[PDB]
Amino acid sequence: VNSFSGYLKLTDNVYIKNADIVEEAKKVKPTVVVNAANVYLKHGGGVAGALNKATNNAMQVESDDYIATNGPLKVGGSCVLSGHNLAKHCLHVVGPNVNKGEDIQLLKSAYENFNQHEVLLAPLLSAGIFGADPIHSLRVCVDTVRTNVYLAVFDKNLYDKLVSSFL
Ligand SMILES: O=C(N[C@@H]1c2cccc(O)c2C[C@@H]1C(=O)O)c1ccc(Nn2ccnc2)cc1
């Protein structure tokens, strides 16, 4: 038993809720919150800009040092950094960005990063301003992630559609 509240059970291990992921993180203080990152860890908008704003830009400062030392991530890759005031850790995961013309197939590789963590609070990878179909992202999530994932979906109308169309 954990502290996530009001989630809907989709499968044995995947749960979903209409909520702002930053607000969920503040309340639950999960061990791991997932960021919808890009390879440069430039957190300007969407989930990434949201999480970074809530950290008062500390996430961006830490990320800039990470990139200066290690260089960019790979599309489909990830790194673990601090969760600051939101979580113990932030797993920065890079899903493909269709609006950048990136390869849709890398979405499964991106979700495989979640399997390294027993429990995560996460967004749907490649959705929103990354350009992919959220219904597809949810399908790849359920078919790839074996650990316990609590998905926060910002948009109410999208949430309702994700639940109603889930196979
Ligand atoms: O971009 C966000 N989310 C994504 C989104 C939005 C629309 C359609 C989608 O498919 C997706 C995928 C993901 C989701 O499902 O939420 C987001 C932005 C700000 C925020 N917090 N915030 C607001 C103002 N200041 C801070 C929280 C989330």
3-state secondary structure the chain: CCCCCCCEECCCCEEEEECCHHHHHHHHCCCEEEEEECCCCCCCCHHHHHHHHHCCCHHHHHHHHHHHHHCCCCCCCEEEEECCCCCCEEEEEECCCHHHCCCCCHHHHHHHHHHHCCEEEECCCCCHHHCCCHHHHHHHHHHHCCCEEEEEECCHHHHHHHHHHCC
- Asked, for residue 3, whether it belongs to a domain, the answer is no
127 in ligand 1 pocket by Cβ < 6 Å? Answer: yes
Residue 74 forms beta bridges with which residues?
none
The verdict on residue 71 lying in a domain is: yes
The letter for the amino acid at 85 is: N
Residue with CA nearest ligand 1 atom 15 = 153
The count of domains in the chain is: 1
95 lines ligand 1 (CB under 6 A): no
Residue 136 forms part of a structural domain: yes
Q: How far is the CA of 118 from the centre of ligand 1 (A)?
A: 24
Measure Cα distances from 88 to 44, 120, 139 in Å.
22, 11, 28
Question: The domain spanning residue 45 has which CATH number?
Answer: 3.40.220.10
Q: Is residue 1 part of a domain?
A: no
Q: Quick count: other Cβ atoms within 10 Å of Cβ 153?
A: 24
* CA pair distance 144, 25, nearest whole angstrom: 23
- Distance between CA 65 and CA 82 in Å, rounded? 12
Q: Would you say residue 92 lies in a domain?
A: yes
Resolution (angstroms) stands at 1.0
Identify the experimental approach. X-ray
Domain around 18: 8-163
- Name the β-bridge partners of 10: none
Distance CA 111, CA 156 (A): 23
Residues 6+ apart with CB under 8 A from 140: 107, 108, 111, 125
Tokens of 54: 């809530």
Rounded to whole angstroms, the Cα distance separating 152 from 93 reads 15
